[PDB]
Amino acid sequence: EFIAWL
Amino acid sequence: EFIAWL
């Protein structure tokens, strides 16, 4: 599982 | 920035 937030 | 890898 990958999560990115900017 | 936030990143998660599980």
Residue numbers in the entry:
A (entry chain B), B (entry chain A): 1 to 6
Task: Provide the authors' original text about this structure.
Here, we identify an evolutionarily conserved hexapeptide sequence as the major aggregation-prone region (APR) of gastrointestinal peptides of the glucagon family: xFxxWL. We determine nine polymorphic crystal structures of the APR segments of glucagon-like peptides 1 and 2, and exendin and its derivatives. We propose that the pH-dependent changes of the protonation states of glutamate/aspartate residues of APRs initiate switching between the amyloid and the folded, monomeric forms of the hormones. Our results highlight the dual role of short aggregation core motifs in reversible amyloid formation and receptor binding.
Crystals of APRGLP1 grew only at a low pH (pH ≈ 2, T = 37 °C) where the N-terminal glutamic acid self-converted to a pyroglutamic acid (pE) via a spontaneous ring closure. To avoid this side reaction and study the effect of protection of the N-terminal, we synthesized and crystallized its N-terminally acetylated form, Ac-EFIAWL. This compound showed similar spectral properties to APRGLP1. In the structure of APRGLP1 the hydrophobic residues (Phe, Ile, Ala, Leu) form a hydrophobic core, while Trp and pGlu participate in H-bonding with each other and water molecules. A similar interface can be found in the structure of its N-acetylated form. The presence of the acetyl group and Glu instead of pGlu resulted in a lateral shift between adjacent β-sheets, allowing Glu to form H-bonds with waters located near chain termini and Trp side chains from neighboring β-sheets. The fact that this structure also belongs to class 7 suggests that the hydrophobic residues are the main determinants of the topology of the nanostructure. In the crystal structure of Ac-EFIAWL, the interaction between Phe residues from neighboring sheets is made possible by a slight shift of the sheets compared to the structure of pEFIAWL.
